[PDB]
Amino acid sequence: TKKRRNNGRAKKGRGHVQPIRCTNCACCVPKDKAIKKFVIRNIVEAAAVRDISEVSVFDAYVLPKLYVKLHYCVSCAIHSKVVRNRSREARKDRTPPP
């Protein structure tokens, strides 16, 4: 039976969207189909930044961040627990929780 209204993806008037590869595997999953994450993160997290301010020669130099747009295939997204199975009404919530 038709589980989702959109066919597990987000094209509705295309027919073909070029696939961007998986990151955990290398599965050829389509662009809209892929679970996409964009990481905005410090190059040293919280414990190392305590120290490196003393080794920084410059007057309170704020770190560069590290920018990774991840492309997950659906077998990889649920392996790493990025996404997750939801109840029949909870499925349709497109609201990303902070």
Partner: protein, 62 residues
Amino acid sequence: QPIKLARVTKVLGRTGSQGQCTQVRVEFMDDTSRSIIRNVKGPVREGDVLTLLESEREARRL
């Protein structure tokens, strides 16, 4: 290095694999404004002083 003696002001919860380590807010006896979050073994109550070995380490918050 200094060997510091940080007083427990709040117990923030219970952590560990088998649930034994106590996530604790320890206030330094030196400075009563500067504090860290520190994981502690053994039965800890509100109003005792640990013997820290260095304060470079700082326990993670959940």
